[PDB]
């Protein structure tokens, strides 16, 4: 039993280590990130989450990047500046992966890009997986 | 209501456009490929599918590349060479994706690469999605 | 402490069927098969000894 899982749960690159690709999520009703490390890290690497709105010139092209806001849960406290962020700990081994997702949608496009671009940033890869088709 | 889809259906990069990355399918019981274009194509691009055995000197590392053999279905015929291959046609638009997978597992690692490396191959991206885990 | 370190699962018992494509009035052909599986459970419930 092997399935064509790509039909129902497609995945798209979001950060290949040198460039960031906006990923459209309008046609799907869930999504989540997946982080992988290809080499041992030397320090913590934080990531920033953005989102885009449809461009005025063309409704099929994204606009400038906006920053996702924070949404506190019933336990815990809000972020210092109230904006979502992701931090990959130094303990991550080359042979393991991490996964996390945002509680809310906001715009129809999403993206992720590191706070700083350096030799330690190229040692990571990020991918986005959709889970449901509404069309 | 969002979900952490990255926990149940992790996705991994396979062909970012300039390099091929082995993907370990050992820990999961299904998988599949997803092809996406980022710029217009000029001619059909064929892809080769491989699999790797465990390396002799270290089980942590994949071995050499081996082609995946074909498995004919009930009412059908085998390929001319007997091996598995995938072809991305010309009509694919930049806003669409294609998904397909092999019927059998073979080795524990998997890989994919274009038959020839040129200006056309760099315009395609490949990602691997995997179903529930087993450990 | 087996019964928690490893599990064994069976799906159906062996079945035998006669094949109409190879059978004649002078011959017979039988087909058979079965299904089963197994998966490790807890990794902390066992140990292994080796020479060193």
């Amino acid at each position: 039993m092997n399935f064509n899982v790509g039909v129902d749960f497609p995945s798209f690159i979001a950060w290949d280590g040198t460039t960031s690709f906006p990923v459209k999520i309008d046609g799907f009703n869930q999504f989540g990130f997946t982080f992988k490390v290809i080499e041992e890290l030397t320090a913590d690497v934080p990531f920033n989450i953005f989102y885009h709105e449809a461009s005025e010139a063309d409704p099929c092209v994204p606009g400038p990047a906006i920053r996702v806001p924070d949404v506190p849960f019933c336990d815990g406290v809000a972020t210092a500046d109230g904006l979502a962020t992701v931090v990959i700990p130094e303990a991550v081994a080359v042979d393991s992966f991490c996964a996390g997702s945002v509680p809310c949608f906001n715009g129809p496009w999403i993206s992720i890009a590191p706070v700083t671009v350096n030799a330690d940033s190229a040692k990571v890869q990020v991918t986005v997986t959709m889970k449901g088709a509404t069309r | 209501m969002n979900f952490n889809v990255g926990v149940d259906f992790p996705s991994f990069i396979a062909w970012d456009g300039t390099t091929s990355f082995p993907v370990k399918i050992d820990g999961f019981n299904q998988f599949g490929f997803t092809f996406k274009v980022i710029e217009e194509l000029t001619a059909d691009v064929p892809f080769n599918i491989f699999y790797h055995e465990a390396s002799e000197a270290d089980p942590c590392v994949p071995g050499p590349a081996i082609r995946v053999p074909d498995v004919p279905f009930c009412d059908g015929v085998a390929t001319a060479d007997g091996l598995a291959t995938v072809v991305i046609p010309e009509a694919v638009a930049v806003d669409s994706f294609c998904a397909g997978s092999v019927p059998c597992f073979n080795g524990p690692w998997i890989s994919i690469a274009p038959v020839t490396v040129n200006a056309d191959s760099a315009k395609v991206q490949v990602t691997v999605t995997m179903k529930g885990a087993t450990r | 402490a087996w019964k928690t370190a490893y599990y064994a699962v069976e799906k159906r018992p062996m079945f035998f069927e006669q094949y109409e494509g190879g059978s004649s009035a002078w011959c017979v052909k039988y087909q058979f098969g079965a299904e089963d599986g197994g998966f490790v459970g807890c990794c902390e419930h066992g140990r292994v000894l080796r020479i060193g």
Binding site: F35, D70, F97 | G6, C60 | -
Partner: peptide, 27 residues
């Protein structure tokens, strides 16, 4: 804020951490 879920490794122990046994007690 996001809570990252991670798994130990792709392999249970890609290089299994075999360990010597406790040394013999005494004479």
């Amino acid at each position: 804020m996001v809570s990252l879920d991670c798994r130990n490794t792709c392999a249970p122990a890609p290089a299994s951490r075999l360990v010597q046994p406790p040394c013999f007690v005494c004479r």
